Amino acid sequence: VYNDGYDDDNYDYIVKNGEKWMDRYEIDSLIGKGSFGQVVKAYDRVEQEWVAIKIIKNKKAFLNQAQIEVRLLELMNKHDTEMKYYIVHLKRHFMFRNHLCLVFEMLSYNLYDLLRNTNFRGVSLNLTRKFAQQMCTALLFLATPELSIIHCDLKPENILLCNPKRSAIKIVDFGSSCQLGQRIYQYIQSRFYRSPEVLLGMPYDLAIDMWSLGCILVEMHTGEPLFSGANEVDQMNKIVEVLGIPPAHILDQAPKARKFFEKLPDGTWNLKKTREYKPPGTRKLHNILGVETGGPGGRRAGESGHTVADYLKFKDLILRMLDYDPKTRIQPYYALQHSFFKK
Numbered sequence: 001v002y003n004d005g006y007d008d009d010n011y012d013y014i015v016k017n018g019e020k021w022m023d024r025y026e027i028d029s030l031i032g033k034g035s036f037g038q039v040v041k042a043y044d045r046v047e048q049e050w051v052a053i054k055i056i057k058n059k060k061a062f063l064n065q066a067q068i069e070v071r072l073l074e075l076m077n078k079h080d081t082e083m084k085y086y087i088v089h090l091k092r093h094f095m096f097r098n099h100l101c102l103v104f105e106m107l108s109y110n111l112y113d114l115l116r117n118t119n120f121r122g123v124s125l126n127l128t129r130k131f132a133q134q135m136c137t138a139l140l141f142l143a144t145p146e147l148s149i150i151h152c153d154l155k156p157e158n159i160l161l162c163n164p165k166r167s168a169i170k171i172v173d174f175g176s177s178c179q180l181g182q183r184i185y186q187y188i189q190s191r192f193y194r195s196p197e198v199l200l201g202m203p204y205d206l207a208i209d210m211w212s213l214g215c216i217l218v219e220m221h222t223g224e225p226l227f228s229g230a231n232e233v234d235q236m237n238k239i240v241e242v243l244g245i246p247p248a249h250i251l252d253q254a255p256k257a258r259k260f261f262e263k264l265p266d267g268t269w270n271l272k273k274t275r276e277y278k279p280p281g282t283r284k285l286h287n288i289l290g291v292e293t294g295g296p297g298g299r300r301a302g303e304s305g306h307t308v309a310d311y312l313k314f315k316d317l318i319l320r321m322l323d324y325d326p327k328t329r330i331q332p333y334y335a336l337q338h339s340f341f342k343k
């Protein structure tokens with residue numbers, strides 16, 4: 001027996017469908033499993049609503065890590081207040097049979113689910129524009145100095161949709177998140193969405209999230225991840241195909257520079273001859289987007305909001321979000337003033 005019979009050998013709560021916790025939560029099913037522990041779908045009898053409960057493992061390590069998450073979730077709750085910034089907010093937390101329990105809103109679809117509903121051909125630049133304004137709004141919120149939060153894991157899997165309030169998304173999972181300055185790491189973000197500064201072992205700040213958003217916006221409208229590397233070297237080759245050799249002022253300061261590039265005798269940087277690759281900067285965004293050919297594989301030809309001028313506005317935005325230099329990558333405030341959003 002562990003935790004009086006309520007826990008398994010591995011510090012996790014033994015989930016039984018139908019259990020009433022404190023005459024308030026009727027548990028329906030396990031819906032989630034992670035290093036942190038378990039997520040459950042439950043009916044909150046008092047608020048007459050479905051909720052998702054994150055049961056943290058019964059272990060000092062995981063409890064204090066989850067208590068870091070609770071700090072950020074609640075700081076994100078002091079600000080905001082009217083739940084209007086596309087963040088899946090913490091409704092509350094309680095201790096039940098020696099497990100920390102975070103209660104969240106239940107949402108049953110992520111961005112992925114919406115791209116399988118398109119057989120991965122993607123969505124109108126009109127819908128992309130809507131989500132983009134939602135995501136950018138969220139990153140603007142996260143960049144409030146008091147917050148200065150880095151999500152560190154933006155990906156379609158972590159972007160949930162409000163079916164009820166159709167054409168609305170929310171960012172989820174702040175368990176991998178950290179605050180500006182907290183202390184640099186080295187292997188963060190989902191590979192496909194991983195910033196060049198992180199690939200290069202350099203320091204990072206809120207801009208890594210804007211990078212990940214650039215790659216998600218393209219993947220929303222093409223149906224296809226922009227940069228699907230099978231390891232870090234392939235990932236950085238796939239980036240260079242599109243954006244060229246990173247500038248010198250960046251590579252000259254990058255610990256992992258030589259894991260991908262080689263400094264020639266004249267001081268100029270180049271790639272390394274070990275799957276061969278387009279030469280640098282020749283898989284153009286202008287073409288992937290189909291800017292002059294009615295969108296990716298010219299599918300939205302004619303359709304309102306898919307004019308050349310629309311795509312010149314979109315490409316300019318993406319390319320500003322995919323800047324190699326995190327000092328000059330577009331920040332969410334100027335990103336919201338972009339013409340791609342304007343009348």
Ligand SMILES: c1ccc(CNc2nc(Nc3cc(C4CC4)n[nH]3)c3sccc3n2)cc1
Nearest residue numbers: 032033034039052104105106107108109110
């Ligand atoms: C385990 C389970 C869930 C997560 C967050 N990912 C997630 N959450 C969902 N639902 C969910 C989570 C939440 C908050 C508990 C975090 N509300 N609703 C859904 S519905 C379809 C895919 C999907 N992916 C992370 C680990």
